[PDB]
Ligand binder design. Sequence first.
Ligand SMILES: [K+]
Ligand SMILES: [K+]
Ligand SMILES: [K+]
Ligand SMILES: [K+]
Ligand SMILES: [K+]
Ligand SMILES: [K+]
Ligand SMILES: [Mg+2]
Ligand SMILES: [Mg+2]
Ligand SMILES: [Mg+2]
Ligand SMILES: [Mg+2]
Ligand SMILES: [Mg+2]
Ligand SMILES: [Mg+2]
Ligand SMILES: [Mg+2]
Ligand SMILES: [Mg+2]
Ligand SMILES: [Mg+2]
Ligand SMILES: [Mg+2]
Ligand SMILES: [Mg+2]
Ligand SMILES: [Mg+2]
Ligand SMILES: [Mg+2]
Ligand SMILES: [Mg+2]
Ligand SMILES: [Mg+2]
Ligand SMILES: [Mg+2]
Ligand SMILES: [Mg+2]
Ligand SMILES: [Mg+2]
Ligand SMILES: [Mg+2]
Ligand SMILES: [Mg+2]
Ligand SMILES: [Mg+2]
Ligand SMILES: [Mg+2]
Ligand SMILES: [Mg+2]
Ligand SMILES: [Mg+2]
Ligand SMILES: [Mg+2]
Ligand SMILES: [Mg+2]
Ligand SMILES: [Mg+2]
Ligand SMILES: [Mg+2]
Lengths: 46, 149, 77, 271
Amino acid sequence: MKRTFQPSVLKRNRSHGFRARMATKNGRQVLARRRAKGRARLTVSK
Amino acid sequence: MQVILLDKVANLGSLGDQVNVKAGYARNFLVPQGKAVPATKKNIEFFEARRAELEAKLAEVLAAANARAEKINALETVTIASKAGDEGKLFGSIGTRDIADAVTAAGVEVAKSEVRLPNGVLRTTGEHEVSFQVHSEVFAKVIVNVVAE
Amino acid sequence: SRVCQVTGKRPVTGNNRSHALNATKRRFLPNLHSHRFWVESEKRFVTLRVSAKGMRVIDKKGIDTVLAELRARGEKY
Amino acid sequence: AVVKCKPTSPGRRHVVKVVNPELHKGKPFAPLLEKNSKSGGRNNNGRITTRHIGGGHKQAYRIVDFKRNKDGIPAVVERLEYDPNRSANIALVLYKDGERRYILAPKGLKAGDQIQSGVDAAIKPGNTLPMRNIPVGSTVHNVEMKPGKGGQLARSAGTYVQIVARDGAYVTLRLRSGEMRKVEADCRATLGEVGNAEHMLRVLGKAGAARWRGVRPTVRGTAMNPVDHPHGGGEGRNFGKHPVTPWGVQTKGKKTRSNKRTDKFIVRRRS
RNA sequence: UGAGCGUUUGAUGUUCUAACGUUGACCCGUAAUCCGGGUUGCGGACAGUGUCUGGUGGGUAGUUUGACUGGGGCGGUCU
RNA sequence: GUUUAUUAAAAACACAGCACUGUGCAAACACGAAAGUGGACGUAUACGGUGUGACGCCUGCCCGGUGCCGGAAGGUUAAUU
RNA sequence: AGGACCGAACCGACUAAUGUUGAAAAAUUAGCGGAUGACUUGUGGCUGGGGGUGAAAGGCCAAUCAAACCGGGAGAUAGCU
Ligand SMILES: [K+]
Ligand SMILES: [K+]
Ligand SMILES: [K+]
Ligand SMILES: [K+]
Ligand SMILES: [K+]
Ligand SMILES: [K+]
Ligand SMILES: [Mg+2]
Ligand SMILES: [Mg+2]
Ligand SMILES: [Mg+2]
Ligand SMILES: [Mg+2]
Ligand SMILES: [Mg+2]
Ligand SMILES: [Mg+2]
Ligand SMILES: [Mg+2]
Ligand SMILES: [Mg+2]
Ligand SMILES: [Mg+2]
Ligand SMILES: [Mg+2]
Ligand SMILES: [Mg+2]
Ligand SMILES: [Mg+2]
Ligand SMILES: [Mg+2]
Ligand SMILES: [Mg+2]
Ligand SMILES: [Mg+2]
Ligand SMILES: [Mg+2]
Ligand SMILES: [Mg+2]
Ligand SMILES: [Mg+2]
Ligand SMILES: [Mg+2]
Ligand SMILES: [Mg+2]
Ligand SMILES: [Mg+2]
Ligand SMILES: [Mg+2]
Ligand SMILES: [Mg+2]
Ligand SMILES: [Mg+2]
Ligand SMILES: [Mg+2]
Ligand SMILES: [Mg+2]
Ligand SMILES: [Mg+2]
Ligand SMILES: [Mg+2]
C-alpha cells in the first residue's frame, strides 16, 4: 500500500533544509545542537 | 491642582489667580489653550515678571475683537445662493463653511469658529440671523439671506 | 508592549490567592492610556502611552522635563 | 419564475428553482470584476473560526456601488445580472458621462429605466437620496449607517426598511428584523425594496446544492463524544443537559448582545 | 433635589467639547484598503482599559470519593 | 452520499426540509494576553448555535422542579467609607 | 436535464476462501458498491498536541492516539514483583 515516506526533494528542503533551519530561532538551536554534537551532516541539504 | 489664569475664563477668575482646578480641566483645556499655566514657583515668578504688561495684550485683543465686531455690524447683510426647489426648501444646506466663506467674500475675513448659529444649519431659504463672536465678551449679529441657485 | 513610556511600569507577575490559599499565576498590568500632550515649546501634540501615575508625574514635572528624560533614555515618540 | 422540477431523480424531486429570464445570459462586465478567493472559514492563524464553510463553486467578485455618490448625473440600466456573491441581483447601469457601474437591483427596475442620485433626484425606485429628502413612510433600501460610508442595511433579496419617523438630525427606521433604530438623516438610502423577492421560495432539493453553495455538513453535538462537545455521550440517544454551543453558552434564548456604544441608536429591540 | 456651613460636598436630568473612541469622508508621507500626521463629520466624558471587588463559571485544571467482609458490590457494622 | 486506515458500513453520521434561539454590523460567534483575522468585501430572503430529519397527516395537557427571558417595589448583600 | 440507469479505466471495500514464523506488520483470488459527482487524482500550500482536523468512529495527526514524537526534570514514585 501507500507507505508513509513519499519523497519530494523540494518539500524536503522546504521542511528540513538549511535555510528553513536558519529562518527561525529554534532551527538555529537545532543547528547549534548538531554542531556541538559534531554532526558531519547538519541538515537534509545535499 | 493649582493654576494661574492668563485670561478671564468664565466663572474661575481674572488675569492672575491662585485657583484650584480639576486636573482634566487643566490638562485638556486650560493649558493647551492660552488660558492657564501650572502654579510651580518658577511659573509664578515668570508670570509676575510681566503681569503689569500682560493687560496690554488682552486690551489690544479685545480692541481688535471690538473692531472686527463693528466691521461685522457695518456689513450686516450677506447673500448666499443654493440649489432650492419649489417653495424655498433648500436641497442642501448653507453651513458654517459657506457662511464663513460668504463673509470673506463680502468683506474682511472671518474664521470658521466664530459662527454661533442658534437654530440650525440653515435648511430653509429666507432671512436668518447668524451670531458671531471673536472674543468671549463680544457678540455680533448678521442678517443672512439664502436665495435660489 | 505594555510599557509606560514615562515611568517604565511593565506588567509584573504575582499570585491570585484564593480563600483556601490556592495560588495561581497572574499578571498585574499598568493602567496605561494613549494620550495627546500639548507641548507649549514646540507647538505640537505628542502622543505617549502613559500610565495614570505617569500622567501624574507629567502634571508634576511638566511635559518638557519628561520629554527630555525620554530623549536622554533614547525613547522615541 | 418559481419552478418545481419534475421528479426524474430523487435528488431532483423536491427542487424548486427560481428563473429570471431578464437576467443577462452572457459574461459579466470585466472592468468591474475582481478575484476573491475562498477561506474555508479559516482566519490568518489558519484555524477554523467559522464552521461549515468550504468548497463550492469559485466566484468572481462584482464591485457593487453601495455609496451611490455620482450626484446629478442620470444613469440608464443596461442590464440585470446574476451576482454569485449575494442573494440580490445586480444591475449594470451606464451613466451619461459614459462610466458603467453595478448597483443592487430593486424590485421595480428593468433595462432601459433611468436612475439618479443626490439631494435633488426624484422619488422613484432605484433613486438614491439622503433620508432628509425622502418623505416619512417611504420604503427604502441600501441604507447608509454613517453618511458617506455606503449601503449597509437592507441589501439582501426582497428586503427593505421603513422610514417611520424623522426628528431633528435622526430618522427612525423599522428594519427587516422588526426593530426600530435611529440613523442620522444625512445617511443615504435607495428608494424601493431590493428585488428577487422569490429567493426565499427556492428549495435546494438535495445536499449537493448546499455543497455547491459552499456549506459543509453540520454535525449535531449530541451525536459526538463528551470530549468533542458538551452534548456528547450516552448509551443510545441521551440528552439531559441545557442546550449550549460547543463552547458552553446557552443557545436556546440567552441573549448575546453587549455593545453599550450603539445602544443609544436602538429605540426598541426586535420582537 | 439631599447633607453640613451664600459656600462646600453629593444623587439625578439636560446641554457643551476639550480628553477619549471612530472598522465616516478627504489630503499628505506615497506608486500604499497597513500605519502615522492633518482637516472635517459623528459619538462623547459615555464607551473602553488597569487595580480592587460581589456574582456567575465542568469552559478549563488539580484532586477526593474509607475500612471490615467466608471474593467484590449491595445490605449491615465502626465508640 | 459518509464512517471505526488495520475484526463493526449499519438502523450510526450527513442530507434537503422544518422549528427554536441568537445576531443592527466595529453583528452574534470563533482563533488570538494583544494587534488583528475569519464570519464577509456578506447585512436579517443574512450569518451563527441548537434540536429534528424528504414527503403525507399531524405534533395533545403540564411553567411544580432546573434553565432561559422580562420586572425590580421590597428583603439580603462586596470593595469603598 | 439528472448528487439518473447499465458498465471499463479510476475510486472504494459487502461476502467467502486462502494466507496468519504471510508473497504482504492488513494483502491475494472469486464475486461486490460508486463510476458527471456531496466524484477522483497530480503538484504546491495552511491548520501543532489539551492543540489541530473530524458528513462524529474517540476517527485521524508519519506501521504510535481517551492526548503524537524527540530531548530534558529523571535514578519521578513503586507499602508492589
Ligand atoms: K448525547
Ligand atoms: K466549571
Ligand atoms: K454500506
Ligand atoms: K415545569
Ligand atoms: K419555570
Ligand atoms: K498533549
Ligand atoms: Mg453552521
Ligand atoms: Mg445570487
Ligand atoms: Mg441543518
Ligand atoms: Mg446534521
Ligand atoms: Mg458516537
Ligand atoms: Mg465537556
Ligand atoms: Mg436509552
Ligand atoms: Mg432520562
Ligand atoms: Mg475535572
Ligand atoms: Mg499531584
Ligand atoms: Mg474493602
Ligand atoms: Mg449508498
Ligand atoms: Mg475496521
Ligand atoms: Mg468492514
Ligand atoms: Mg471585522
Ligand atoms: Mg435523528
Ligand atoms: Mg410536544
Ligand atoms: Mg432575572
Ligand atoms: Mg449516477
Ligand atoms: Mg455502474
Ligand atoms: Mg492510482
Ligand atoms: Mg477484488
Ligand atoms: Mg445502483
Ligand atoms: Mg464510544
Ligand atoms: Mg497511524
Ligand atoms: Mg494527560
Ligand atoms: Mg526531580
Ligand atoms: Mg526508575
